[PDB]
């Protein structure tokens, strides 16, 4: 906004985005599906939920 050899001035525009939480969850586990093998009319088959 101003530029002398002994003086300066600047302006900065900052925009902020604050997420407001509804609930916070701390003690958490990841799921790992393993399933089960089934041997049916000769064929081996992997079964999963």
């Amino acid at each position: 906004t101003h530029s002398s050899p002994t003086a300066t001035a600047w302006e900065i525009g900052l925009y902020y985005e604050l997420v407001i939480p509804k609930h916070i969850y701390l003690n958490n586990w990841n799921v790992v599906n393993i399933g089960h093998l089934v041997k049916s009319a000769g064929q081996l088959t992997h079964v999963t939920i």
Partner: peptide, 17 residues
């Protein structure tokens, strides 16, 4: 049309000695 197998993830049930 026959009834098929049942699975219940019980290890103790499938023990072989």
């Amino acid at each position: 049309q026959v009834l098929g197998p049942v699975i219940d993830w019980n290890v103790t049930q499938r023990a072989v000695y």
